[PDB]
Design a protein around this ligand. Structure first.
Ligand SMILES: Nc1ncnc2c1ncn2[C@@H]1O[C@H](COP(=O)(O)OP(=O)(O)OP(=O)(O)O)[C@@H](O)[C@H]1O
Ligand SMILES: [Mg+2]
Ligand SMILES: [Mg+2]
Lengths: 147, 76, 985
């Protein structure tokens, strides 16, 4: 557990992710805070989203718990910050690094999936009235993800 | 060479392997046929648990040999 | 009419029909020694109609070696007479009787006949009768470290269930015109060739939905074939398939026919030449006993060994056995003839009891027909085993001294064991230790810990407890019971009610652990197993692990500096469903049960906790606002459960339950169908509600419907419990109150600044002040499956079935709902007996201090199919550190309480390695990439001071060591793995 977590931390330190920055909270190795920058070619451009990562006692044999702290208007992210990502529930394997999870979350942000949604109302808006979805996403990322 | 794998639940699996194959290849075949990751597979032949990095010929596993795929249980 | 309050865990293994057949079957057991009493105990706990005992032989002292219902005050009394009274207490539904005389014609009253400690001529006489009258016959034998079982269920035995697995079911994607059935994306059917399946909900091929089973030809992990479906249709879309299990006809041979041409069951494939040897050996034992007035060969006697080998030669010649006799093995069988070990008795008794249940239920695959087993690797080699050491001393351990000797008895009597857990395996282990004489010496001791209490469902497989003991601590009851069994254990057992974990290190500290000899786990979760494994690795103590599940079980041994620990391997993890599947798109009853459990928690537990916390913590509002993810939900919960929706009578509870019914089974479905109409399509043109997504339909409340009324009753009762109001059960009041209900109108909402903070503040000030309500609390609901009067399982079942009705899923009953929601682990007494026997067979290997790794065995078994397998433990991996061989698991660095700088310098100079990371527990003490100022602040501090500073917590006075994890790099910059550090405070 500790060996793997420190290996990931050192690997992050050597090569900056540029688009992300994750690290332990205070000195606790099992509670990290990460930052994701909104993709330029997305409604969330120019926004910073904070995520909380909880490594279980059985890491890497159980998935880390990743939640959004900032509020985001996304079809696959609900009000509690839960993320509809397969690799975090049952497809988790002890071979995926935190950087891979951050890349997966960024790819989720750059294009949502309304065909298997977590928030049906936002998915309906996205599928029927795209422009209103764009306006709502920009408003939310301007009044929550900036400042 | 053809070998058989018997699970603790009674299922039987037929694998087409060669005497020079490593245990890693056999575990990958078992994963393909069953979906069990290689790190969670416990294979037993003739009272020896097969370990990664070695070959079948190291355990003298020949054609029509029977292996057992087992697992640990949490109750009790 | 099965008492599900007692057979709860056993019904999940066998079922209602199997136990119904069991409750009408009579079992006769001939012989009341350790093996016979073990079989009778397991059968009485199982729940057969009745048990009859036949053993008129007077009791002897040596019989106490494995007979735990015999005392030293019963010498000279027939064994059955003194055993029936104690066997009659195990289960109140199973009478136990004794017959002083047995006749052949009397055998027709019994469904199964078990024979132990009987000569071969009598066995032939009994089997000649039972075989022709279709009576199940089992014969078991235990000689020292050798055992044998023989089963004969008749020529026309019908086995309805062969492997004991649940039928396989799966969702189809498309069925071609040639019968090629394909599963959904990345889904495995799990079928084998020759299976039978039946289809339902198949679109385009109605013929397949009749229910006629069809042969299966597996063409891969994702597709199979059923034949030609040309006539029924062209192609079928969607649908589900379910496996059909067909009965099998098994034909057995009589003992007389089976002696000449036996059929063997091999418990180990590493030694496949032995069972033919044991077949001759046991018959030679019978002949020797017949030629010596029923006396077996004396322990370690060479004259008797020679005569026995002559008998073996004669029998092998007579039976035309073309096998070369192994003289050493056969004479070993001769030497240990008078041995009577409680571990072998428990192992064989569990196996034989499972066979009896198979006979009486026609379930699972029986042994066919001979099962010869040996544990000869347990024979000590560090002591002198000879005729002088193995002679009887006139004590209760004669049956064990006849195998191991007096010196090994002295070694056993000095053990200082630690048993973690006091469940079924714990009770069996304690019995085995008491019988073996463990810790009865001047320097022996036993410590047992368990924080749980005895419940009604535990009495089905934990035989040390009685109905009078319900509500008491398991460890104390077990210690008292075993002290009753073996009086020499009086004052040599200490019982704790402490949970073993990080919070109990003050009791199970360095001083406690340094005195132990071995640790035995009897737990039921992996977290505690891993913790105890780490503690044993740190203190370098042997560990005995065991686990069971239904009819399956395993046992593992961890030996310091020899094998790998328990935590060096992985097990499959628990499966959790995606949140999107549970929340909106369920397709299995498990999804609806999980949703119903979440609904229970969110309706009766979380709001109550929020209200209680608000009325206790003076500054709860600000902390919740700045901490909770959704403070608006917390404020709404507090308002609703304090002022807005506070009930003043049970009628208001009924109205609230009706409102919740509308909210969760009619309105959310309407909203979902407004967002995704049934005719909607995805972005690729496919229909949305296809495959794993089932289109729901809102429910309209009908009072006369059973599920609706059940939900209303359960919800109203739980709400009244929350508010402490009297709850009625008469349907008249419910029907009278709900008659005058006007549903508020509902229309799905299409959607379409910081002023909301003003609304939040208005809600916050609308709440009554905490000082206005002093001494007022709301009782939360803590989930409890085992109580049938708290409406927990009732509510979960009703909600799950209503949501299934929403999505057209097949509902389940309270039995399956309780199994799924409660995370109940199926359990059996037979599997517990088998695992205890195997663990106690490895224990004597540990006591002897065997060094080679080929002498230890890890065991796995499945009794439903009669599978046993053993394998050597995996040796601990090695590594090269500074050109030295280091054990990767069992080695550590021992350092004083030096400074961080001194530790770094020591590693740089002594080991030649550069330290890059140093952590303790869950904190990072030192890292190479930290800023220089922080390091300069931390470098000159001692390790204890550094840990205290970083964790902001003083070290406890009892803390005598620190465990540090270190990552270091060599001169070239390559990372080299090193063992952990043990700082001595
Ligand atoms: N960390 C622990 N420390 C000590 N004892 C433990 C610990 N975890 C579990 N146990 C005990 O181990 C035993 C497990 O055995 P078992 O599962 O048969 O019992 P149970 O959990 O009470 O029963 P059931 O699972 O049938 O409801 C129980 O006594 C449980 O209290
Ligand atoms: Mg319990
Ligand atoms: Mg349990």
């Amino acid at each position: 557990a500790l060996k793997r977590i420190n290996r990931e931390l050192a690997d992050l330190g050597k090569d900056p992710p540029s688009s992300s920055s994750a690290g332990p909270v205070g000195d606790d190795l099992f509670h990290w805070q990460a930052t994701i920058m909104g993709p330029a070619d997305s409604p969330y451009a120019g926004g910073v989203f904070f995520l909380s990562i909880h490594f279980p006692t059985d890491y890497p044999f159980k998935p880390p718990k990743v939640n959004f702290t900032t509020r985001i208007y996304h079809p696959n992210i609900n009000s509690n910050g839960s993320i509809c990502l397969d690799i975090l529930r049952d497809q988790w394997s002890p071979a995926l690094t935190i950087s891979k999870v951050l890349l997966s979350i960024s790819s989720l942000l750059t294009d949502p999936n309304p065909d298997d949604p977590l928030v049906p109302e936002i998915a309906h808006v996205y599928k029927t009235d795209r422009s209103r979805y764009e306006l709502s996403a920009r408003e939310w990322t301007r009044k929550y993800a900036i400042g | 060479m053809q070998i058989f794998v018997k699970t603790l639940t009674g299922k039987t699996i037929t694998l087409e392997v060669e005497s020079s194959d490593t245990i890693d290849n056999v575990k990958s075949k078992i994963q393909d046929k069953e979906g069990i990751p290689p790190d969670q597979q416990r294979l037993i032949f003739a009272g020896k648990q097969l370990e990664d990095g070695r070959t079948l010929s190291d355990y003298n596993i020949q054609k029509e040999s029977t292996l057992h795929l087992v697992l640990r249980l949490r109750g009790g | 009419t099965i008492d599900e309050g007692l057979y709860s865990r056993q019904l999940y293994v066998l079922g209602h029909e199997a136990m119904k057949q069991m409750s009408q079957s009579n079992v006769l057991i001939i012989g009341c020694k350790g093996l016979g009493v073990e079989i009778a105990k397991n059968v009485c706990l199982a729940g057969v109609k009745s048990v009859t005992l036949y053993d008129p032989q007077p009791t002897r002292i040596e019989d106490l070696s494995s007979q735990y219902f015999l005392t030293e005050d019963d010498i000279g009394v027939p064994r059955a007479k003194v055993t029936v009274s104690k066997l009659a207490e195990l289960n109140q539904y199973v009478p136990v009787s004794v017959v002083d005389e047995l006749s052949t014609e009397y055998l027709k009253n019994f469904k199964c006949v078990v024979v132990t400690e009987t000569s071969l001529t009598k066995q032939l006489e009994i089997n000649d009768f039972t075989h022709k009258n279709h009576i199940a016959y089992i014969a078991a034998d235990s000689r020292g470290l050798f055992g044998s079982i023989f089963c004969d269920f008749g020529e026309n035995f019908i086995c309805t269930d062969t492997d004991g697995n649940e039928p396989l079911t799966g969702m189809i994607a498309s069925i071609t015109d040639d019968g090629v059935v394909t599963m959904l994306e990345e889904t495995r059917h799990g079928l084998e060739n020759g299976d039978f399946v039946k289809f339902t909900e198949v679109k385009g091929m109605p013929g397949l939905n009749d229910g006629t089973p069809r042969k299966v030809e597996v063409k891969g992990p994702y597709t199979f074939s059923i034949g030609s479906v040309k006539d029924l249709g062209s192609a079928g879309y969607n649908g589900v398939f379910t496996q059909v299990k067909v009965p099998t006809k098994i034909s057995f041979k009589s003992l007389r026919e089976s002696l000449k041409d036996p059929e063997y069951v091999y418990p180990d494939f590493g030694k496949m030449m032995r069972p033919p040897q044991y077949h001759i050996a046991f018959q030679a034992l019978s002949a020797f006993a017949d030629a010596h007035e029923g006396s077996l060969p004396r322990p370690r006697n060479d004259i008797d060994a020679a005569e026995f080998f002559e008998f073996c030669k004669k029998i092998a010649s007579t039976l035309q056995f073309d096998v070369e006799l192994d003289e050493k093995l056969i004479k070993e069988i001769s030497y240990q003839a008078r041995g009577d070990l409680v571990a072998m008795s428990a192992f064989l008794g569990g196996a034989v009891a499972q066979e009896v249940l198979k006979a009486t239920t026609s379930k699972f695959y029986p042994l066919k027909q001979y099962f010869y087993f040996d544990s000869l690797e347990s024979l000590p080699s560090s002591v002198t085993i000879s005729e002088e050491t193995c002679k009887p001393r006139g004590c209760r351990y004669d049956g064990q001294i006849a195998v191991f000797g007096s010196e090994f008895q002295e070694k056993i009597a000095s053990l200082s064991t630690f048993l973690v857990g006091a469940g079924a395996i714990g009770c069996e282990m304690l019995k085995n230790w008491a019988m073996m004489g463990v810790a009865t010496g001047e320097s022996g001791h036993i410590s047992v810990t368990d924080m749980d209490s005895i419940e009604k469902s535990n009495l089905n497989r934990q035989f040390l407890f009685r109905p009078r003991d319900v509500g008491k601590l398991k460890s104390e009851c077990a210690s008292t019971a075993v002290s009753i069994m073996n009086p020499s254990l009086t004052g040599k057992i200490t019982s704790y009610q402490e949970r073993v974990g990080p919070e109990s290190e003050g009791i199970f500290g360095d001083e406690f652990f340094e005195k132990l000899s071995l640790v035995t786990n009897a737990l039921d979760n992996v977290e505690a197993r891993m913790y105890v494994d780490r503690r044993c690795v740190f203190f370098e103590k042997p560990l005995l692990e065991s686990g069971t599940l239904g009819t399956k079980g395993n046992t593992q041994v961890v030996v310091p500096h020899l094998t790998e620990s328990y935590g060096s391997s992985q097990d499959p993890p628990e499966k959790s469903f995606p949140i999107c599947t549970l929340k909106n798109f369920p397709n299995r009853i498990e999804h609806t049960i999980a949703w119903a459990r979440d609904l229970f928690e969110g309706l009766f537990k979380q709001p109550i906790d929020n209200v209680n916390m608000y009325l206790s913590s003076p500054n709860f509002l600000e902390t919740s606002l700045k901490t909770s993810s959704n403070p608006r939900e917390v404020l709404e919960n507090i308002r609703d459960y304090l002022v807005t929706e506070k009930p003043l009578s049970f009628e208001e509870c009924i109205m609230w339950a009706r409102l919740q019914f509308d909210k969760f089974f009619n309105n959310n479905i309407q909203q979902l169908l407004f967002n995704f109409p049934k005719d909607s399509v995805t972005s690729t043109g496919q229909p949305f509600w296809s495959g794993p997504k089932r289109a729901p339909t809102p429910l309209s409340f009908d009072i006369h419907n059973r599920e609706h009324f059940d939900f209303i009753v359960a919800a109203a009762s739980l709400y009244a419990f929350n508010y402490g109001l009297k709850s009625e059960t008469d349907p008249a009041i419910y029907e009278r109150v709900l008659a005058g209900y006007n549903p508020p109108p509902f229309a799905p909402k299409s959607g379409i600044a910081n002023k909301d903070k003003q609304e939040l503040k208005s809600i916050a000030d609308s709440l009554p002040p905490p000082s206005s309500l002093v001494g007022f609390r709301l009782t939360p609901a803590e989930f409890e499956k085992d109580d049938d009067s708290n409406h927990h399982i009732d509510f979960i079942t009703a909600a799950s079935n209503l949501r299934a009705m929403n999505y057209d899923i097949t509902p389940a009953d309270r039995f399956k709902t309780k199994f799924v929601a409660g995370k109940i682990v199926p359990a059996m007494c037979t599997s517990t007996a088998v695992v205890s026997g195997l663990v106690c067979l490895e224990l004597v290997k540990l006591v002897d201090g065997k060094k080679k790794i080929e002498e230890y065995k890890n065991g796995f078994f499945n009794l439903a199919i009669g599978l046993f397998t053993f394998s050597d433990p995996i040796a601990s991996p090695k590594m090269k550190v500074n050109g030295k061989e280091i054990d990767k698991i069992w080695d550590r660095y021992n350092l004083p309480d030096c400074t961080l700088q001194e530790l770094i310098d020591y590693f740089q100079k002594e080991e030649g390695l550069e330290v890059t990371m140093l952590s303790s527990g869950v904190s990072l003490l030192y890292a190479n990439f930290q800023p220089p100022k922080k390091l300069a602040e931390r470098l000159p501090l001692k390790i204890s001071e550094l840990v205290e500073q970083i964790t902001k917590k003083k070290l406890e006075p009892f803390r005598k060591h620190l465990v540090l994890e270190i990552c270091c790099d060599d001169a070239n910059g390559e990372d080299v793995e090193v063992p952990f550090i043990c700082i001595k405070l």
